[PDB]
Structure formats: C-alpha cells, structure tokens
Symmetry: C3
Subunit: 123 residues, 3 copies
C-alpha cells in the first residue's frame, strides 16, 4: 500500500528542479561576460578621450614658430578605489560559485542515492 | 499509517521552489535589459566622439582663406569581432532560456500530476 | 515498512535546493552592482565629453583681442525617458525581490515543519 509510484514522481521532480538551477548558473555566467565586455570597450574609449586632450589648438599661430599643445587629462582612470572594490566583487562571485558547486555535487550524490534506494524497494 | 499529510507538505514545498525559480528567470531578464540599455548609450557616445575628431583648429588662420579640418576616427567601432561574438552570447541565452521553459513546463505537468495522484489516495 | 529513511533524504534534498536558490539571489545582487557601477563611470565620462565641447580654437587669433569658445553639447544627457524607464526597471526588481523573500520565508517555515513532523514519526 506504499505510494512508491508517487515517490518516484516526487524524486524525479527534484531532479528536474536541480537541472533548471544548474541552467541558471550557466546563464548567469553569460550575463557576467556582457558586463565585463562593456568594460573592455570603456578602456578603449578612455584612450580616445585622452587623444582629444592632445587636440587643443593647431596652426593657431602664423607669426610664431611654435604650436600650443595642452593634453589635459580627459578620462578619469581608476587605479585603486575601483580596482580594489572590483576585485572584492569578483571574489564574492568566486566564493558563491564554489559554494553552489559544492551543494550541487552533494545534491547529485544524494539525488542518485534517493533514486537508488527507491529501486531497492521495487527492484 | 501512511504519511500522506507529510507528502502533501513535501509536494507543496516543491511547488514553492518552482515558483521562486521562475521568479529568478524574470529577474534575470531585467538584468539583461540594463546591460543592453548601456550599449545603446555607448552607441550615442561614439557619435559624439566622432564629432570631436571634426573639431581640430578653427580660425587658426587669418592670412589664408582656408580652414584645416582633421576628422581622425575617435570611437573604435566594432563591425565583426564583437558583433559575431555578441550574437553567439545572445544565442546561448536563447538556447538556455528555451531549455529552462521546457523543464518548467514538464515540472508543472508533473507537479500537478503528483498532487492529483495524492488527492486520489485521500479524495 | 514505511520509507521514512527515504523521506529523510528527500526532505534533506529540498533543503539543499533551497540553499542553492538563495545563493543565486546573492549572486544576482553582485551582478546588479557591476551594471550600476558602470553607469557611475559613464556619468564621469559625460562630464569630460562636455569639457571637449569647450575646446574649440585657442590662440586661433593673433590680430584680434578675442577668443572663440564653442561649448556645443557633447554628451546627450537623459533627463526623463531613461530615468522614468530606469526607475520602472529598478522597481520591478524590488517587487520580484520582495516576492522571492516571501516564498523563501514560507519554504523555511514549511521545510522546518516537514522535518519536525518526520522526527515525530521516528522521534
């Protein structure tokens, strides 16, 4: 009179939920790539911003043998405050990622065991 | 002596977990919109960067009837390398999204069936 | 002849899945911070873009006591269309976040109850 058939469905439902959770993990990685990719473009833009500062006044002098160049900084480069804070951000993802992998590995071992034990009841 | 009341709670817990997973999917879409929205702003910025290149030296000549215009490229536009790679990124999200929807649809059909069978035991 | 040992494993598997889901929530917050952080950098860049517009032609005149300054807008600032739309984006995350917390709180109360009832069967 045991509801093993019902347990088989419940145990299977957990497996399907585990698979979807894993998919979210891979989808999250794709989103992280887009954000980082934008930063690479930003670095290229700072460089061009610097080139402007070089552009100030050309030929602004026809009775002098000199050219005035004023390369005043344009892109505010972050050396420490963002870098140190950004490293912390990347690291937290690393600890959470490692933790999720540990739980997933345990769920797989346990999920297989739950199913293996179920087979023994009706093997 | 069967623990159907306990199964009712377990089956219900799976339904609540399924709902939260779905919420993460919608939340993920909102995050994707913010990243893409930033790219649209970036495209507008490249345009203004191009306008600078046009600015070089105005009136830098009062004894000549000519103006020196040097529109040297400023924004490095990505035609293929990023576009081809970005398309792949968007596509992987598409295949993972389609896969998650398939698993969710199966979980709903199965979740309802697990509950429907439980009612039969105590209907 | 009841499979309580099997239920103990199934109930435990749900707890492990709940923990991983929570981790995704915290990981999602880190991703949101990176996107917003990029916007702060963008605001700094608009400012420097504005400074360029100020740079037009310096010393472009040695027989006149005047300087031509043309600060034509450079960064297209979004006052309403993006702000109003961005607020909606942040708000939807707020409603989904609040909803996920409610479901998580119910799952914890129910998860503990499912385990508590199981102990009674074999306490």
């Amino acid at each position: 009179a045991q509801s093993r058939t019902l347990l088989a469905g419940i145990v299977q439902q957990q497996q399907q939920l585990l698979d979807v959770v894993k998919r979210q993990q891979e989808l999250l990685r794709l989103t992280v790539w887009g954000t980082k990719n934008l930063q690479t473009r930003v670095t290229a833009i700072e460089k061009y911003l610097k080139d402007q500062a070089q552009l100030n006044a050309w030929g602004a002098a026809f009775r002098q043998v000199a050219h005035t160049t004023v390369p005043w900084p344009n892109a505010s480069l972050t050396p420490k405050w963002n870098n140190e804070t950004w490293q912390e951000w990347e690291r937290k993802v690393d600890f959470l990622e490692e933790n999720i992998t540990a739980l997933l590995e345990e769920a797989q071992i346990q999920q297989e065991k739950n199913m293996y034990e179920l087979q023994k009841l009706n093997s």
